[model samples]
Target: SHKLLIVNNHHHAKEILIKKGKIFAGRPRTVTTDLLTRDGKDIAFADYSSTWKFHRKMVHGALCMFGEGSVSIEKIICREASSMCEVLTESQNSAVDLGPELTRAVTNVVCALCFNSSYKRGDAEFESMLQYSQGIVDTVAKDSWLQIFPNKDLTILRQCISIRDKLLQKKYEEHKVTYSDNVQRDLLDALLRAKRSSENNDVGLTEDHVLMTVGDIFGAGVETTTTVLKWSIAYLVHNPQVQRKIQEELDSKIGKERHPQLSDRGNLPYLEATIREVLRIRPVSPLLIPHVALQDSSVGEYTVQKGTRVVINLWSLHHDKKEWKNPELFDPGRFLNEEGDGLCCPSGSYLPFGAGVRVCLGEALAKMELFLFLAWILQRFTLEMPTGQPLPDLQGKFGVVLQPKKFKVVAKVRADW
Candidate 1:
């Protein structure tokens, strides 16, 4: 029998992931993850070790450079955010599945960072990658159960992974040929440079490692950002006062002359707070990526043995009554301070991006994407539920991530804009 530990409390979560994070910062190995990742060469599911640390530092450095260099991450995000706005505006009030377009917009940004490339909707390569990415997500979620019914997902995931690896393999070849010390093109260039350096220092890895690392970034970055945007829109439709307050903030601060910027994030408290609440109310990763004990570890009162699977029930912590008043209610004000400013760290319960030494490497970049993309959406359009059609259910379908059910909203361009 396998031992499992579920961490639902906020403070104890700190104890495990933060206080004694080093002792508890390992990941549980599984047949599925091993197959998908080839013995945990990727950072997200890799066992805590020197190689994992190397990949993590490389990814973190890549992100920092990606944020600052050439076409700024802000520019890429705004460009894509504006593209999403264009797509919505073209559709007018007609009910359209916003999911695909959002997914595409997000994928492009990842592409921009990962391989220094982007693709349009009908592009076969782009479409294939997106579909396979989702397939892998669905397959990975059922992994524990699929262990019993191995062939069902194993067959599908292997196919998906094969295709994903091929795609990255091709890109890897291109970057290897174009390898340069004078200029860095994108994240791939950065990774190749690091790999070359690692080789000299006995720190390099297989090509599969580079492929899987890029795969992890694309998979993690795209879905969560897209899902939260969907929830943000759905929540805006359900809460008019909240919508108006944020739009007011947007109009007064950003104006309609240009797209939203990261600089405007602080000045727009309601927008920031609302996004936090959406993340709180409908976290994309409710039960976060499981962490395992490297050796034996303690979760306050209980001793967690090695090789145990531990999950943080983020949904519970976000809704804990003790930490959040009327936790069920969609109130962004809970994140606001008495001085009438928005609190970035509202309470112990808010861990949308998770926490600790193993905290998401993409946290800073994700926030910039979330704030700029979301603020731009509100800045250009007043989102609304279709007038004649039945309201799209706001409830999420729990999968690899807490994905929103298919929903359509009318993005009527603002008159003020």
Candidate 2:
């Protein structure tokens, strides 16, 4: 049996993440992840090497092509936010479980980014994606002992993997045919452009590589963002005061006359604070995908040998009592300064997106989507639980990501908005 050194505190986490980041940058290979990523072909789960670095670089470059300093991503996110608001407006006065709607909005954003495609409400392919993504998250990365034995779970996993692969492959094939040098339409196109320009045959950028790279972005982009939104909604419903404060901020800063825009992010301090709080309270990935020691290394005082897989317990970091006052409490005010006009993280106890060389590639994009989506929703609606229903559970159902349990909220459209 193999063992992993669990790093719980910020001190040790800093060692693994910041101090000796490269030493602990490797990802341990597992049967489930291998099956999912074709044995380290993707960035997140791939072991450290030149090939992996190149893959990360290509994907990162491709992402920056369309994501950074571009008005396009903001426009795309706002469009989805508008559609989502329309959906909420339609379902007003009724208790609605907004999971699917939120998932669709986030999915479309990622979809548009990756494949330059979008899915309609109740689309068959989107439904299949919802199912398979959840299955993959639930099944993969937890296969420590299950790797040796074949069972019903493995059969289902294979089926899920096949379905996901088929979907990815179809998109990859379509891109291959339509590939052009002059135009970079989406992330896939950008990746294709990079692959075509490379001279080294050894730095293989095969079809599988492209698909898996897109798959990482697609899968992570949809699930983690959606889960965060869900948790935010649930927490808002549970703590009406927090919701009210955000609405107040929205009311004063950007009224009903205009929609919340990306530029308005600097104005809505409370809303930004709430988003940060949600990430802090319920990080999507508690124990981020495990990092392996590339070679013999030391994390602080502890000696880590080669092949030592280190898992940082982010739950502990976020909930540290010495660092955060009343750590269990959901208080967005913690992120605000004394004047309540600016945002501030008082402690180094938070790393929701992880830090260092392997920090989340989608961090910037995810923040943009989260800010716009929540700003739009809270601007127009006051979320509250049904009269007879209880507060939504805060103890999330943990899988690859921490997901809130299914719950419904009554969206009361603001009289002014």
Candidate 3:
């Protein structure tokens, strides 16, 4: 229990939240979430009102329509995953900064979903957008006291706010020219359609809304998944035994001629368990997005007051000694069943994607990307830590998200396979 308490009391967090309207119902004045949200108009930061509900519903519907079983989106993910394989294959037998490669993969996935376009690996515009989004997430992650200070004296926060606004404006102008209103289908197209259909003059979405939504998808979606991939690779490199077990399962289940796809996920139990183990050990957001209590409520014996910020201590929950045996250890087998000795993780035990009404909107998309991309990479390459570089640090640096420190690794093509 820390200041600005953010807890994830699964059964009753919402009950307490419903009563306290002032602080719990409204958005907090954080610099990053506020700036990226375009003054809190975007769905994630919007207040619990009719407008928020409308936007949330629209987002949910659009994603469901275009994601997972939807081949159009799946095709894009597969294409990008293949391209990522090519990149790693070319760089095999040498050290490659997987960070950028993973970033590009995640970016293209979102770009295709949002704009129905894909960028070449070195496209200047794509790279620039990635850098800008990274800057925003990084700045927010830093412990700048200015973020919490009164708005009147917060120069640093003001500067970050201004920079984000200008970036959003530039993106909006480009999107308007390139994306035709008559041909809208993706998220942007949906938003534009909503804008045109709205009768209430004051409730219509502005250009800022489009830009911020783009920023939200890129900034929030890309970095989180990319970091997870990086951590997964690092873990594999260090835990060669686990990596071998996973590779063996893939070979036996899917064979080396073809790579793992969404459909194949059901048969690849070990790979599935390995993924869960990676997330459990290295959760990208150890402390997920903070939730506030809307009203006075009690959990167990603790009486939480209205306006109290709740942090779902995922780090603690994932490693709770009472719940998990050797929780800190990187053991994928924990997810396996004892009778059949296959994958069977208990539900709600893992909170890598958070939960409830405000859970990650892109969970399904991100999972597909992660599993497909990682499986493709491992199918072709055997990753290892660079010589003399001691095992890559597993300690995560806390920010708006938990990120691994910079590290390098060698990925060699598995010629025998």
By TM-score, the best candidate is: 2
Per-residue accuracy of model 2 over 1-417 as CA lDDT, tens digit each: 676888788988988888888899988877888898898888898877787788777666666666434557778899999999999999988999898999999999999889988999989999999898767877764733335655437677888999999998899889889887777878899878777777443766877888888899998999889999998888888888988888888888888789899899999888888899999989889998888888898876788898888899999889989989999898998999998979998789899999987889889889999999999988899998887988887888777888878988999998886
- Which prediction has more favorable lDDT, 1 or 3? 1
Worst 10 residues of 1 by lDDT: 143-152
Q: Which ten residues in a row have the lowest lDDT in candidate 3?
A: 14-23
For candidate 3, what is the lDDT? 0.70
Model 1 residue runs over 4 Å out of place are: 67-70, 143-151, 202-204
The sequence of per-residue lDDT tens digits that candidate 1 reaches over residues 1-417 is: 778888879988888888987787888677778877778878888877787788888777776677444557778888998888888889987877788888888878888888878888788998898878878878777634435653455688888888988888898898888787987877778778877777776343677787778878877778778888888777888887998898888888877677677888879888778877888899888988888888887787898898788888898999888888788889888777876565756687788888887888888877888888878777777878787776668777777889878877888888875
Better of 1 and 3 by TM-score: 1
Q: What alpha-carbon RMSD in Å does predicted model 2 have with respect to the real structure? A: 2.2
- Candidate whose lDDT is highest: 2
User: Between prediction 2 and prediction 3, which has the larger lDDT?
Assistant: 2
Q: Order the numbered candidates by TM-score, best leading.
A: 2, 1, 3
Better of 2 and 3 by TM-score: 2
Question: Candidate order by lDDT, highest to lowest?
Answer: 2, 1, 3
Q: Taking the tens digit of each residue's C-alpha lDDT, what string does model 3 give over 175-195? A: 667766555557766776777
Clashing pairs in model 2? none
- Candidate 3, which segments miss by more than 4 Å at Cα? 1-3, 6-27, 67-71, 142-171, 174-182, 200-204, 339-342, 346-349
Better of 1 and 2 by lDDT: 2
Clashes of each: 0, 0, 11
